[PDB]
Sequence to fold (218 residues):
Amino acid sequence: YLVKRAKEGLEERLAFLFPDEEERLKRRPEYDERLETELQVINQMGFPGYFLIVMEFIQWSKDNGVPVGPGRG
Amino acid sequence: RKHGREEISYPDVQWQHESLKPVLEPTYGIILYQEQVMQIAQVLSGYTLGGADMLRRAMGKKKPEEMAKQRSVFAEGAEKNGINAELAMKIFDLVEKFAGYGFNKSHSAAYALVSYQTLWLKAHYPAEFMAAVMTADMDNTEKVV
Fold:
């Protein structure tokens, strides 16, 4: 579930950051490789519930009227 | 070094290597960050990401035994990448000096983004924002003044 929402969240960001699809393809591999390298450590350390709680929490507070500060450690 | 009053080096006049240039570019060859410590171990000496984080951690503690081992791994790691050994070790001494002051770039950046947002707003629509600034310090007469 995390892998899915993260790959697909990255797809939103990618189209916002690089709205030229030619450039998005050439700039993309670095991000996918970084994404899966991180994904591997998160899953193999065994925290997927934790990340899910927090992502949902952060999103919901954006949808509704909670601005969140820059802090994230 | 930013304004051409001294030659820019990557990072030092003697102890520099051109592979450090993309890492140190934005800071004019000055080792400022925790994350630069880690990028230098990646690029110069071929560390794993996790072993790189362990070096920066060992640099925070500053312990006797600790360094001695990594000091050796970091020497033969640079040798294996064809980078000069004495250069690699003398750069390690500078990394260790600056690691003591090294601030967390990722922590600085998250907050600095918010500073830039308050900066852009003030420049482009700086009335409402100022009103908000006044509300933030509303009860203080001195600050309001």
Q: What stands out?
A: Chain B is about 65% helix and 0% strand. Helices of chain B lie at 21-24, 34-43, 49-61, 64-80, 85-99, 105-124, 128-136, 141-144. Chain B touches chain A at residues 49, 107, 110-111, 113-114 (CB under 8 Å).
